[PDB]
Design an enzyme around this catalytic site. Structure first.
Site, PDB file in Angstrom:
ATOM      1  N   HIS A  60       0.821  -1.210   0.000  1.00 58.01           N
ATOM      2  CA  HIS A  60       0.000   0.000   0.000  1.00 58.01           C
ATOM      3  C   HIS A  60       0.859   1.266   0.000  1.00 58.01           C
ATOM      4  O   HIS A  60       0.337   2.388  -0.247  1.00 58.01           O
ATOM      5  CB  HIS A  60      -1.129   0.086   1.104  1.00 58.01           C
ATOM      6  CG  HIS A  60      -0.503  -0.152   2.453  1.00 58.01           C
ATOM      7  ND1 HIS A  60      -0.415  -1.394   3.058  1.00 58.01           N
ATOM      8  CD2 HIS A  60      -0.004   0.739   3.290  1.00 58.01           C
ATOM      9  CE1 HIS A  60       0.158  -1.196   4.243  1.00 58.01           C
ATOM     10  NE2 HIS A  60       0.432   0.088   4.428  1.00 58.01           N
ATOM     11  N   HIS A  90       7.382   6.768   5.508  1.00 60.85           N
ATOM     12  CA  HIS A  90       6.634   6.449   4.296  1.00 60.85           C
ATOM     13  C   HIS A  90       5.966   7.800   3.779  1.00 60.85           C
ATOM     14  O   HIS A  90       5.994   8.838   4.388  1.00 60.85           O
ATOM     15  CB  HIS A  90       5.496   5.430   4.383  1.00 60.85           C
ATOM     16  CG  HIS A  90       4.586   5.637   5.553  1.00 60.85           C
ATOM     17  ND1 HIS A  90       4.821   5.258   6.824  1.00 60.85           N
ATOM     18  CD2 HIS A  90       3.372   6.290   5.564  1.00 60.85           C
ATOM     19  CE1 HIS A  90       3.831   5.529   7.597  1.00 60.85           C
ATOM     20  NE2 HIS A  90       2.942   6.217   6.871  1.00 60.85           N
ATOM     21  N   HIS A 115       5.493  10.876   6.005  1.00 61.27           N
ATOM     22  CA  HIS A 115       5.170  10.662   7.444  1.00 61.27           C
ATOM     23  C   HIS A 115       6.320   9.886   8.138  1.00 61.27           C
ATOM     24  O   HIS A 115       6.693   8.767   7.869  1.00 61.27           O
ATOM     25  CB  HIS A 115       3.875   9.917   7.704  1.00 61.27           C
ATOM     26  CG  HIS A 115       2.555  10.473   7.225  1.00 61.27           C
ATOM     27  ND1 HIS A 115       1.492   9.669   6.764  1.00 61.27           N
ATOM     28  CD2 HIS A 115       2.116  11.722   7.036  1.00 61.27           C
ATOM     29  CE1 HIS A 115       0.495  10.420   6.367  1.00 61.27           C
ATOM     30  NE2 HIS A 115       0.870  11.674   6.554  1.00 61.27           N
ATOM     31  N   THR A 194      -3.507   6.800   9.713  1.00 63.67           N
ATOM     32  CA  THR A 194      -4.354   7.039   8.532  1.00 63.67           C
ATOM     33  C   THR A 194      -4.611   5.788   7.699  1.00 63.67           C
ATOM     34  O   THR A 194      -5.319   5.808   6.643  1.00 63.67           O
ATOM     35  CB  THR A 194      -3.878   8.318   7.786  1.00 63.67           C
ATOM     36  OG1 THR A 194      -2.631   7.982   7.201  1.00 63.67           O
ATOM     37  CG2 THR A 194      -3.749   9.564   8.754  1.00 63.67           C
ATOM     38  N   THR A 195      -4.050   4.691   8.207  1.00 64.73           N
ATOM     39  CA  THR A 195      -4.243   3.399   7.481  1.00 64.73           C
ATOM     40  C   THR A 195      -4.717   2.457   8.599  1.00 64.73           C
ATOM     41  O   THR A 195      -4.372   2.667   9.808  1.00 64.73           O
ATOM     42  CB  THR A 195      -3.036   2.721   6.740  1.00 64.73           C
ATOM     43  OG1 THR A 195      -2.083   2.544   7.826  1.00 64.73           O
ATOM     44  CG2 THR A 195      -2.393   3.580   5.622  1.00 64.73           C
TER      45      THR A 195
HETATM   46 ZN    ZN Z   1       1.207   7.587   7.091  1.00 65.25          ZN
END
Ligand code: ZN
EC number: 4.2.1.1
Length: 255
Positions: A60, A90, A115, A194-195
């Site tokens: 992802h 990432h 991030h 956020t994931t």
């Molecule tokens: Zn992130």
């Protein structure tokens, strides 16, 4: 879960109910509503002793991992209490220059978003931290398209080797200090990953000042694959999550 039409952000709440919680990220930063908070301390980034190990394609995004067995690459100061160790970094990017960031500034969307993840050493390991309301500190940095980023080139040259899901590559002596903006002025608020699992354990710190990368740099990102080797090619683009409701929370500024 993913970022396609059938398993994208709008569908995550089905396996991850915290998806519609009270402290979800990312969010839109209303610069006119953010509160100037004079009690914020300057940020303290100590990265000179950072030890990178590898980069991997997790299906992802791609993660650059760091050795977090000692206080080698740490974050403190700002709105933080205690020391946070760098565990990994990432990005999120778009199919076009017009989209890609998660966090938005007055509704403006940036080409990508970097991030920097850190965990609170008082919790002993990353798995414990993600169980706490003050478990992580994510350093968010915007990327805009202009001039190339000398310091990001090393990452770009190695993407060829992790095109598909599951690939990883030795990635030593990578200095993160090359991805930082000149200013450390920031906005901060309480949020989440956020994931998935989207755990409401993060203290977000978004840098005001963006970094510029060249078009060819970011072009290289768009060449990665969501899929595993030997499967139909799904280009790894638009791996960002839409802005969530602020719901009462207050965004504070260090400036
Ligand atoms: Zn992130």
């Amino acid at each position: 879960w993913g970022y396609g039409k059938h398993n994208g952000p709008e569908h995550w709440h089905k396996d991850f109910p915290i998806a519609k919680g009270e402290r979800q990220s990312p969010v839109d930063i209303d610069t006119h509503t953010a509160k100037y908070d004079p009690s914020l301390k300057p940020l303290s980034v100590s990265y000179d002793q950072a030890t990178s190990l590898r980069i991997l394609n997790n299906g992802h995004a791609f993660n650059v991992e760091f050795d977090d067995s000692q206080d080698k690459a740490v974050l403190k100061g700002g709105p933080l209490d205690g020391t946070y160790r760098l565990i990994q970094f990432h990005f999120c990017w778009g199919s076009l220059d017009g989209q890609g960031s998660e966090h938005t500034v007055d509704k403006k969307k940036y080409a990508a978003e970097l991030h920097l993840v850190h965990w609170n050493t008082k919790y002993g390991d990353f798995g414990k931290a993600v169980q706490q309301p003050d478990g992580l500190a994510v350093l968010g940095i915007f990327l805009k398209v202009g001039s190339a980023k000398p310091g990001l080139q090393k990452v770009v040259d190695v993407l060829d080797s992790i095109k598909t899901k599951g690939k990883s590559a030795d990635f030593t002596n990578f200095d993160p200090r090359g991805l930082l903006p000149e200013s450390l002025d920031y906005w901060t608020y309480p949020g989440s990953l956020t994931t998935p699992p989207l755990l409401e354990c993060v203290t977000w710190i978004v840098l005001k000042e963006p970094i510029s990368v060249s078009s060819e740099q970011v072009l290289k990102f768009r060449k990665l694959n969501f899929n595993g080797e030997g499967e139909p090619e799904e280009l790894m683009v638009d791996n960002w999550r839409p802005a969530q409701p602020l719901k009462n929370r207050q965004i504070k500024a260090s400036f």
